[PDB]
Amino acid sequence: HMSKTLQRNRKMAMGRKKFNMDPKKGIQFLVENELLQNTPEEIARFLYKGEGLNKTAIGDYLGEREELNLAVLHAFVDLHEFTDLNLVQALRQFLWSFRLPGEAQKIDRMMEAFAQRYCLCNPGVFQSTDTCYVLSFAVIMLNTSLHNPNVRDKPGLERFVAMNRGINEGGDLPEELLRNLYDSIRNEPFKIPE
Ligand SMILES: Cc1cc(O)cc(C)c1NS(=O)(=O)c1ccccc1
């Protein structure tokens, strides 16, 4: 239906613009105009694809405490494919995905969901999802330490290895795994989406 399709393609683009201004209103427009199905899985797919979507607005929507938004956050994490990625590669991708909001409880929630998904995708690498979470923040801290020129006590490989001793349910992670994470960060800082 040529006319109906052209009108809907234009409304889709209007809904994207409205989302960037106010994510609740944007989603409402798309839903009420039958351009997006009001399900956690469809809204998450929309946000994951992110065509013409402001990443700060994506993150604001994903970090809300409401029922639907929590379910969207879960579904959005489910769309990330972390299989055979090292923790740093997985992180880069997730963090580029949307702009993490500044609130601590939002961060916690989002990184827990990340950690769960990384472990699911890579069974047996970490003994627990707590190991994964802790090492994720180890990696984030390393990114600041190494790459913020104001930090002058920069951890070398040996010290970073030592900082993580006993993390894996009492065991130490393979030295080669920690070195590879270290090298990845040292080589390429995380990119923030602004
Ligand atoms: C704040 C932020 C948000 C992003 O979407 C991506 C990045 C790399 C950052 N900065 S970040 O240093 O990796 C980071 C700091 C604190 C918590 C989580 C991540």
What CATH number does residue 71 fall under? 1.10.220.20
Does ligand 1 come within 6 angstroms of the Cβ of 192? Answer: yes
Does ligand 1 come within 6 angstroms of the Cβ of 107? Answer: yes
The pair of three-digit structure tokens given for residue 90, joined into one six-digit string: 């997985």
Apex 152 CA angle, 147 and 157, nearest 5:
65
98 and 15 in one domain?
Answer: no
116 and 63 in one domain?
Answer: no
Q: How crowded is residue 91: how many other Cβ atoms within 10 Å of its Cβ?
A: 23
Q: Which domain holds residue 12?
A: 1-80
Domain boundary among 16, 49, 80: 80
72 and 27 in one domain?
Answer: yes
Contact yes or no for 76/44 (Cβ under 8 A): yes
Contact yes or no for 76/48 (Cβ under 8 A): yes
103 and 55 in one domain?
Answer: no
The backbone torsions φ and ψ at residue 11, rounded to the nearest 5 degrees and listed phi first, read -65, -40
Q: Among residues 35, 48, 115, which one has the least CA distance to residue 79?
A: 48
Give the separation between CA 70 and CA 168, rounded to whole angstroms.
Answer: 29
156 and 71 in one domain?
Answer: no
Contact yes or no for 102/71 (Cβ under 8 A): no
68 and 11 in one domain?
Answer: yes
CATH number of the CATH domain containing 186: 1.10.1000.11
Contact yes or no for 57/20 (Cβ under 8 A): yes
Give the type of residue at 82: F
62 and 113 in one domain?
Answer: no
Q: Among residues 65, 147, 150, 148, which one has the least CA distance to residue 108?
A: 65
Give the type of residue at 12: M
The pair of three-digit structure tokens given for residue 111, joined into one six-digit string: 């990184």
Does ligand 1 come within 6 angstroms of the Cβ of 146? Answer: no
Give the separation between CA 55 and CA 171, rounded to whole angstroms.
Answer: 38
Domain boundary among 17, 51, 80: 80
11 and 35 in one domain?
Answer: yes
Give the separation between CA 108 and CA 142, rounded to whole angstroms.
Answer: 18
Sequence-ordered list of residues with C-beta below 8 angstroms from that of 194, at least 6 positions apart, any chain: 55, 56, 99
116 and 35 in one domain?
Answer: no
Give the separation between CA 128 and CA 147, rounded to whole angstroms.
Answer: 29
Query: What sections of the chain are H helices per DSSP?
Result: 2-21, 23-32, 40-49, 55-62, 67-78, 87-97, 104-121, 129-147, 157-163, 175-187
The pair of three-digit structure tokens given for residue 117, joined into one six-digit string: 């998904």
190 and 153 in one domain?
Answer: yes
CA 54 to chain centre: 15
Sign of CA dihedral 118, 122, 128, 131: negative
Catalytic residue, candidates 66, 103, 158, 175: 103
Does ligand 1 come within 6 angstroms of the Cβ of 97? Answer: no
Sequence-ordered list of residues with C-beta below 8 angstroms from that of 81, at least 6 positions apart, any chain: 121
The residue nearest atom 13 of ligand 1, judged by CA position, is 140
Q: Among residues 154, 150, 73, which one has the least CA distance to residue 106?
A: 73
SS3 (DSSP) at 171 = strand
Give the type of residue at 167: I
CA 85 to chain centre: 14
4 and 55 in one domain?
Answer: yes
What distance in angstroms lies between residue 33's CA and the mean position of ligand 1's atoms? 35
Residue 103 is among the residues annotated as catalytic for this protein = yes
Domain boundary among 20, 51, 80: 80
Q: How many domains does the chain have?
A: 2
99 and 35 in one domain?
Answer: no
Burial 114-140 (b: 16+ CB within 10 A, else e): bbbbbbeebeebbeebebbbbbbebbb
Give the separation between CA 194 and CA 35, rounded to whole angstroms.
Answer: 27
